[PDB]
């Protein structure tokens, strides 16, 4: 990301005027958590070509829409963000000039033109992701490949998410009557060839530093020598130079799960390439150690987390940017109070960014949870539920 301007008007202390440039899909996700509905975005497009009717007839130009925002089409994997709206129109003639009033309009984001955000609820949490990550150094380094005896998934561990790229899969050996109808072996060879081709295209030994290979069984180990066989066949020095970015791991299931088994479990990653993955893995670790050893020291849920805040008992408050930017403003007034109330009774805090596996995991827990200093048995009766 690059921020061209960023200014603080003089009749309005709060919101802002941001002119900014997304550089990759990690900046398309940041922008996501920044634009709010009713904020106004001003772009360039190419809204040329017309009916006929009087004349042929058109012209061209290069017309920019100051569009009110109303909704969004976001697909991170597909590296596509688009914002839908109606024209602000413009405004005095000073903007929108050339635009035909009365006409919805959208802005599909590009990495080449900057655009300006006339923002209303520009906050300190956003400003962190617009001046920290926003991370003109970039530390997120990882790709995975989880594989069962029959399916594999090329994936990309993101500055938050275990985004799939390619749900590959072949005709897996099921053990035939005969010695294994050479069908099994032939099928296996094709498969080895298939993933190699995929990773070769999908990955790029230029920005990535870690590639994780995990499977229940020898399947991950097999895939690693298959990866490098076919490299030495293509003489693919984008992979052969980097024989030291690969790390082979075991996980219980060869589905997406295996990623959070390897990353957050102290088996493979420690403190190797961990920077944006640091802390957040351990805390979500311990959270599930505690809650799950039915010790009453890990809790989830708006009620129970507000309750654990009346006793001051909270050691680590867990919140998400998925529930935050997922849609709504008022609801976060409470969730801030709730942090202060628990800490004023006890704790630090940890916000999970959110297409992430860890943020999804806490999202699957209502985007709110806590770790305690002490056991509080039954925080779920008084208030009525589990």
């Amino acid at each position: 990301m690059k921020v061209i301007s960023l200014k603080k008007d003089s009749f309005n202390k709060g919101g802002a005027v941001i002119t900014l440039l997304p550089e990759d899909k990690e900046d398309l996700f940041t922008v996501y958590q920044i634009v709010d509905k009713d904020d106004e975005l001003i772009f360039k497009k190419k809204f040329t070509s017309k009916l006929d009717e009087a004349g042929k007839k058109k012209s061209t130009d290069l017309v920019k829409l100051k569009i009110k925002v109303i909704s969004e089409d976001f697909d991170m994997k597909d590296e596509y963000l688009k914002y839908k709206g109606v024209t602000v129109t413009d405004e005095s003639g000073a903007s929108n000039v050339d635009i035909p009033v009365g006409k919805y309009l959208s802005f599909t984001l590009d990495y080449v033109y900057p655009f300006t955000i006339i923002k209303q609820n520009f906050n300190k949490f956003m400003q962190k992701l617009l001046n920290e990550a926003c991370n003109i150094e970039y530390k997120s380094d990882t790709a995975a490949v989880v594989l069962q005896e029959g399916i594999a998934h090329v994936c990309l561990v993101t500055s938050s998410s275990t985004i799939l790229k390619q749900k590959i899969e072949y005709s897996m050996p099921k053990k035939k009557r005969t010695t294994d109808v050479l069908k099994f072996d032939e099928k296996t060879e094709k498969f080895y060839k298939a993933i190699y081709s995929a990773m070769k295209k999908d990955l790029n030994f230029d920005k990535l530093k870690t590639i994780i290979l995990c499977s229940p069984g020898f399947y991950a180990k097999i895939l690693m020598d298959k990866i490098f066989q076919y490299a030495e066949e293509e003489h693919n020095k984008k992979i052969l130079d980097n024989k030291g970015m690969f790390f082979i791991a075991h996980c219980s299931t060869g589905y997406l799960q295996g990623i959070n088994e390897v990353l957050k479990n102290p088996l493979y990653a420690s403190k190797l390439q961990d920077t944006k993955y640091s802390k957040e893995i351990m805390v979500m670790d311990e959270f599930l150690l505690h809650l799950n050893k039915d010790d009453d020291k890990a809790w989830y849920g708006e009620k129970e987390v507000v309750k654990a805040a009346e006793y001051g008992a909270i050691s680590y408050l867990l919140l998400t940017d998925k529930v935050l930017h997922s849609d709504n403003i008022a609801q976060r007034e409470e969730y801030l109070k709730l942090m202060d109330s628990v800490e004023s009774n006890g704790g630090k805090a940890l916000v999970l960014s959110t297409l992430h596996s860890l943020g999804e995991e806490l999202d699957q827990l209502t985007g709110i949870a806590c770790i305690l200093k002490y056991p509080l048995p039954d925080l779920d009766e008084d208030d009525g539920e589990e």
């Binding site: 099994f184 219980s252 039915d294």
Partner: protein, 516 residues
């Protein structure tokens, strides 16, 4: 050029009759409608008779305008993963007489190598395991052998933990279940863990209605074929089986070596290494199973509606890529060849070309003929007129009568929990293992616990009365049109599933209801 709808008011002053006059009079008098009078006064130009004559005329239009096949007994071999359960099952396979087998002895010996790890009927089977690595699993889950009494199916739990799923939900429930244990000190102490997959591999079985179990002590040879270690082994292995639910008196213990072949084919007189044991051999014990009397010939275990779960889909020459060979369990009802099976999911149907009952035997190529099978049995079917895509695993097939079978996404389940490290939080992801299918799922929510709202801890079921280990709503993460399933009530192998967190199995349950 046409219809002349001038005159219209202009004429009234040109001719001079006014017009607000005749109007009221005639109307009322007569009893028809307006619009006619204005036309008629123009068409006879301000007349007052001939138009009225027409009017007296006007309304006038009247609106205003059998044979029993004997088994043939199925067994699943269960064990840790290192007792040499494979070496022992291949020895039971060898040739069912035995030796002669002269080619197969050579081929097993070829299987890396003829000189290397040398050979005695089983070491050579073990070297076929080392080649087979190289395309994981070259021989089949189909295996059969024969004994003096019966024809046997074996399916042999792996080898890396997968064929145990090929038996339970998997094929032909098991007349008898075979636990293979290692006599060694470290290997028996391992395997046997409450946590082991071995205990689970036994636990389904006992849940299933698998009433007979045979327990075979492999690897005697390292522990000097010992009396004291063997009786000490019987003494742990049984109280472990009772914790599973098994009947310790009903269980045969047979000392064996898959690796030398002692007590496998002939009784342990052949074994000079143990003189103290006097009892039957491992084939003699398996053969020892009581014959159930086949039919009732044409008769019941479901007459009830047919429900067949589809474990696997695979192509064949005669039978397509699918609607091709299909493998799975007969959840309820019965199926016979030449019959029509309907698959509600694909809204397609097919004809059963062939049926392979339990024990894996008669191949597709040789013969095409074989009678019949009741619930509980696995089948490997062949489907004639249906297309590769049409059936996928998880589908349930049935007849048109009590047809369709219905199917969906999330479901409600009464799970019970065991000893866990972690508990289940509402929203926690787990991996569900129904049949062939193993999928990620979210136990979203925790609707109820014993009968309260809480997270789910260990050993939780309602203590007495209604049993509420936990009432849960489980959602499939993986795919839209997520999974086909049935309630346990109409049929349990479709209905029964296991839940496991990472490695460990946290809980098991029955599917109570189907939701959208």
């Amino acid at each position: 050029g046409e219809f002349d709808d001038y005159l219209n008011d202009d004429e009234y002053e040109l001719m001079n009759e006014v017009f607000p006059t005749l109007k009221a009079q005639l109307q009322d008098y007569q009893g028809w409608d307006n619009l006619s009078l204005k036309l008629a006064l123009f068409d006879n130009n301000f007349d007052l008779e001939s138009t009225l004559a027409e009017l007296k005329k006007t309304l006038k239009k009247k609106k205003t305008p059998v044979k029993s096949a004997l088994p043939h007994l199925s067994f699943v071999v269960l064990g840790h993963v290192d007792a040499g359960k494979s070496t022992l099952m291949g020895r039971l396979l060898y040739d069912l007489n035995i030796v002669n087998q002269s080619q197969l002895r050579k081929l097993q010996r070829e299987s890396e190598t003829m000189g290397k790890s040398s050979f005695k009927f089983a070491w050579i089977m073990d070297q076929t395991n080392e080649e087979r690595e190289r395309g994981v699993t070259v021989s089949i889950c189909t295996s059969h052998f024969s004994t003096h009494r019966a024809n046997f199916t074996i399916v042999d739990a792996p080898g890396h933990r997968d064929f145990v799923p090929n038996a339970i939900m998997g094929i032909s429930q098991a007349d008898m279940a075979i636990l293979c244990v290692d006599c060694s000190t470290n290997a028996f102490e391992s395997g046997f863990d409450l946590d082991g997959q071995t205990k689970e591999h036994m636990l389904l079985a006992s849940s299933l209605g698998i009433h007979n179990l045979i327990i075979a002590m492999n690897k005697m040879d390292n522990v000097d074929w010992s009396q004291q270690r063997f009786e000490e082994i019987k003494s742990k292995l049984l109280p472990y089986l009772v914790d599973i639910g098994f009947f310790e008196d009903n269980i045969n213990w047979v000392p064996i070596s898959g690796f030398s072949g002692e007590g496998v084919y002939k009784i342990e007189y052949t074994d000079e290494v143990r003189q103290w044991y006097n009892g039957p051999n491992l084939m003699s014990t398996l053969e020892n199973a009581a014959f159930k009397i086949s039919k009732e010939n044409e008769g019941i275990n479901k007459d009830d509606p047919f429900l067949f779960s589809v474990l696997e889909i695979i192509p064949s020459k005669k039978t397509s890529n699918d609607l091709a060979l299909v493998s799975g369990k007969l959840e309820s009802g019965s199926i016979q060849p030449g019959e029509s099976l309907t698959i509600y999911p694909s809204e397609q149907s097919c004809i059963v070309d062939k049926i392979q009952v339990g024990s894996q035997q008669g191949q597709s190529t040789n013969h095409e003929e074989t009678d019949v099978a009741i619930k509980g049995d696995f089948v490997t079917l062949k489907l004639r007129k249906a297309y590769p895509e049409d059936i996928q695993n998880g589908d349930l097939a049935a007849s048109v009568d009590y047809s369709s079978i219905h199917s969906a996404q999330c479901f409600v389940l009464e799970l019970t929990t065991f000893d866990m490290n972690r508990p289940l939080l509402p929203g926690t992801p787990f991996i569900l293992f129904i049949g062939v299918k193993e999928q990620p799922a979210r136990i979203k929510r925790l609707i109820s616990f014993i009968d309260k709202g809480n997270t789910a801890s260990k050993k939780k079921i309602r203590h007495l009365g209604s049993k509420q280990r936990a009432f849960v709503e489980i959602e499939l993460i993986e795919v839209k049109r997520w999974i086909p399933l049935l309630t346990a009530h109409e049929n349990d192998r479709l209905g029964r599933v296991v839940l496991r967190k990472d490695g460990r199995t946290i809980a098991a349950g029955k599917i109570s209801e189907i939701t959208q």
